[PDB]
Design a protein around this nucleic acid. Sequence first.
DNA 1: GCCCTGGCG
DNA 2: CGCCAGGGC
Length: 159
Amino acid sequence: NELIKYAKELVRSAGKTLKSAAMFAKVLTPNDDSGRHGVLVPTEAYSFFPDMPISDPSQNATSNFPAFDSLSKTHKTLAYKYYERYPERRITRMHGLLNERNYDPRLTIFLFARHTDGSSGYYFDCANSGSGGRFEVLFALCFGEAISPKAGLFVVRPI
DNA sequence: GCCCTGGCG
DNA sequence: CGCCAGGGC
């Protein structure tokens, strides 16, 4: 299974071994980027991310969460933003690869894994369609070979 | 780098 | 909702 091999490889790159995992993968829309606009989180994907209490829906809120950045192979802190005026939620502080706009389509993959040692954690990977890019291979693993990539398209599902 | 807030169909 | 947009520091 090419998706399971990928997920296991991503966890092992952080020095853990995968017990189980969930994935949220999103083909970005042109407005999305690393954080000036962030990656907009579809409502159906809120439950994939950590609980962020919104104590007052009339006020902005913000949470951090740790995530292993696959491109840099280092642990990072992402920001999970609630902006009340829309209302909507964004991820920001992602890898700067996402800022380059001339190589669409772009993909983000988030993986939440339970580890065999009883720990758990988030993982992030991303890609575009430029020369040497990884969009096609990653899109095929997350979504299959039969469906068309489409800006905004996303999947949330167990591994 | 990441903040925040204007807007649209 | 899903998405477009842009100035501040």
